[PDB]
Amino acid sequence: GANF
Amino acid sequence: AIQRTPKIQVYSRHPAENGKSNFLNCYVSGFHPSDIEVDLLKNGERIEKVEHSDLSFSKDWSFYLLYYTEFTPTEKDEYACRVNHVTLSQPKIVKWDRDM
Amino acid sequence: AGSHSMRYFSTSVSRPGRGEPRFIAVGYVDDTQFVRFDSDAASQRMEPRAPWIEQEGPEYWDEETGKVKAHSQTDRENLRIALRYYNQSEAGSHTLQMMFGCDVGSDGRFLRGYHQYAYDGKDYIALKEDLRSWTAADMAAQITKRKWEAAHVAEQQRAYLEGTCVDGLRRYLENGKETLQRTDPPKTHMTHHPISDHEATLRCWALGFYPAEITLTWQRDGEDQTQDTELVETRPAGDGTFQKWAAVVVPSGEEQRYTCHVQHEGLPKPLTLRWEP
Ligand SMILES: [Zn+2]
Ligand SMILES: [Zn+2]
Incomplete structure (x- = not known):
């Protein structure tokens, strides 16, 4: 779900 | 990029009895990256109806796969697993030893 | 479990x-x-x-x-x-x-x-x-x-x-x-494989167990042989169970010094195997  | 070379085990599901149908397994593990080619061989020749498990990986992030096929071992037929991977200069062939 | x-x-x-x-x-x-x-x-x-x-x-x-x-x-x-x-x-x-x-x-x-x-x-x-x-x-x-x-x-x-x-x-x-x-315990046995006139392989087998977690170890005279045991990775049988073996190379005639030890959640008691032809 979270981007780098 | 860490590269890890595959470990290979070739073995039957059940203790081999000449004449009785069984399953021939080739378990490939510990490799990275994930692209790999695996063939089961009967007397040097690629076996056709070979299935394999879904790509998974271990705690150290290295991949593992099980390839398998039904087979009926005999006294003289040789079986092997042939594996190619980027870490190998040449395809590695591992012969089935019914005691391992 | x-x-x-x-x-x-x-x-x-x-x-x-x-x-x-x-x-x-x-x-x-x-x-x-x-x-x-x-x-x-x-x-x-x-x-x-x-x-x-x-x-x-x-x-x-x-x-x-x-x-x-x-x-x-x-x-x-x-x-x-x-x-x-x-x-x-x-x-x-x-x-x-x-x-x-x-x-x-x-x-x-x-x-x-x-x-x-x-x-x-x-x-x-x-x-x-x-x-x-x-x-x-x-x-x-x-x-x-x-x-x-x-x-x-x-x-x-x-x-x-x-x-x-x-x-x-x-x-x-x-x-x-x-x-x-389920916690299906391993079925265990030992095999013996002469290598030469000086040495033989004892191999300890665990078959048909679930879940995969298991400990297979060799002792000589009650001492862990971790520095000399060939231990294969636990492997799937394909039918929902797992397999593992551990092997040691043994000088001829010294088989009785060696014991194989099996720990698995399905076992009431840890097992100890000896070569008993
Ligand atoms: Zn439980
Ligand atoms: Zn000699």
């Missing part, structure tokens, strides 16, 4: 010049796989891989399929971000792996949670054991850690891992109870 785990795993592999990255995800309860998704497959759905998961309603398959597809898009984006962080070219193929899950005790209570990433086979960022902060492995991962800290990703993950993840694991253990709760 005394404790249980649910684990989800995903792998994305970029394919420069050959379209979007290959994405493969699998879910496990203990050592039993129960779902998969493969971006190469025609259905574009999450698919069952154990019979008991088919007890889940159609809403489950729709919702999980949407989430796994959204995750494949996130990891497509993250592979692009990684190229920039590491100043790598668009010509090479790279790998992004993720794992998350939870452990619960046999009393049904949360034990531990996990949420981690690896890039090209090396740790990138991982949720720490207290589920409150991140271990970031290198300079690029600190950029991610900063962003995740400001967005409170750890609190979102902690709430999923202690809540929905535990609830799902407990439901699966109920629906798959007959198979998931």
